Design a protein around this ligand. Structure first.
Ligand SMILES: C=CC[C@@H]1/C=C(\C)C[C@H](C)C[C@H](OC)[C@H]2O[C@@](O)(C(=O)C(=O)N3CCCC[C@H]3C(=O)O[C@H](/C(C)=C/[C@@H]3CC[C@@H](O)[C@H](OC)C3)[C@H](C)[C@@H](O)CC1=O)[C@H](C)C[C@@H]2OC
Ligand SMILES: [Ca+2]
Ligand SMILES: [Ca+2]
Ligand SMILES: [Ca+2]
Ligand SMILES: [Ca+2]
Lengths: 195, 112
């Protein structure tokens, strides 16, 4: 029996609101180059104090165990993706430059392009600049669990890729991704709400 | 107020979801004009969530714990207990009241 998302929508429109909700949920828990970031010098200094409390061993870096020490992070289906994205150099831990850079993307002062880039990074597991079929399946599966059958997820992943893959290499580039989502509110999903 | 529940067929009348319980539900979602926008029944795949902890829209978190195990009901959910002014992209317009047919199939390991 064929399966399609409501109104035959693509998997990015479908999943990005939940991606933004889950990541901003974790950022709220955590919060409770630098000079080019979306934060003034004062806000950066407040983040320095938030960073220091999370680094329990005073390494100057936050590791996976220190992130998962928060209950709101360990129960979160996107915790592993957020941690990997924050680790910009891919070294296993996040220094302060990475901490600030990751949070800066979610500022209300940030632009559409860096929020599109963060969203893309959620799906691009191996960081090669392309969302592969398997990556898109894996990350969607992380969020849906057993609420769709694997074969249902395969149909909508395959259809979305067929629709977005303009040059027909079987993967989704950043440009193909941003064109797919140009008429949905990705910036809103990828913004931590301002008082 | 934000969610009203109309019982269509009763459950066992004794087992109700509590905050933090995981529920298993078959649902069909409709707009007020009656048009179906989604259905777990049509894809033959029940929906499971922890209830009462903000993992689903407020109308479900407040309506589902009122149901007893096995009940079929209709939840009418105002936009403040649903997707609000934004709506849900591709599916739900802004400022939409939502009508869910809901069957409570499981509470944790208890099954109807
Ligand atoms: C990787 C995929 C994403 C992941 C998708 C799944 C696990 C598959 C699961 C069957 C959802 C359906 O997928 C076919 C589809 O179900 C709807 O059609 C629907 O009938 C609905 O209203 N439901 C689903 C059943 C519980 C109540 C309500 C809901 O609470 O849904 C929740 C919801 C959308 C909350 C938003 C999230 C964003 C916030 O900003 C907003 O805040 C106000 C609240 C769902 C369960 C999220 O927790 C989880 C996800 O989104 C939505 C109209 C759109 C939704 O697709 C997304
Ligand atoms: Ca440390
Ligand atoms: Ca690093
Ligand atoms: Ca990739
Ligand atoms: Ca391509």
């Amino acid at each position: 029996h064929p399966y399609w998302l409501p109104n035959f929508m693509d998997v990015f429109t479908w999943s990005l609101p939940f991606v933004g909700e889950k990541i901003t949920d974790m950022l709220i828990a955590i919060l409770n180059i630098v000079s080019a970031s979306n934060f003034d010098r004062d806000e950066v200094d407040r983040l320095r104090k938030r960073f220091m409390k999370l680094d329990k061993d005073s390494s100057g870096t936050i590791d996976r165990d220190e992130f998962l020490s928060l209950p709101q992070v360990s129960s979160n289906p996107l915790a592993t993706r957020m941690i990997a994205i924050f680790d910009e150099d891919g070294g296993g831990d996040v220094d302060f430059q990475e901490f600030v850079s990751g949070l800066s993307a979610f500022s209300s002062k940030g632009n559409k392009e860096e929020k599109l880039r963060f969203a893309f990074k959620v799906y691009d597991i191996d960081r090669d600049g392309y969302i592969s079929n398997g990556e898109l399946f894996i990350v969607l599966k992380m969020m849906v669990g057993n609420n769709l059958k694997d074969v249902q997820l395969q149909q909508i992943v395959d259809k979305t890729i067929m629709e977005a893959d303009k040059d027909r290499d079987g993967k989704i580039s950043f440009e193909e991704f941003t064109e797919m989502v140009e008429n949905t509110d990705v910036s809103l999903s990828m913004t931590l709400s301002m008082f | 107020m934000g969610v009203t529940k109309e019982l269509k067929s009763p459950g066992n009348g004794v087992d109700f979801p509590k905050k933090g319980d995981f529920v298993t539900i078959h649902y069909t979602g409709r707009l007020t004009d009656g048009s179906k926008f989604d259905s777990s029944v049509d894809r033959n795949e029940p929906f499971q969530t922890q209830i009462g902890t903000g993992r689903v829209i407020k109308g479900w978190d407040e309506g589902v714990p009122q149901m007893s195990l096995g009940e079929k009901a209709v939840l009418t959910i105002t936009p403040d207990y649903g997707y609000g002014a934004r709506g849900f992209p591709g599916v739900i317009p802004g400022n939409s009241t939502l009508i869910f047919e809901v069957e409570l199939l499981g509470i944790n390991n208890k099954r109807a």
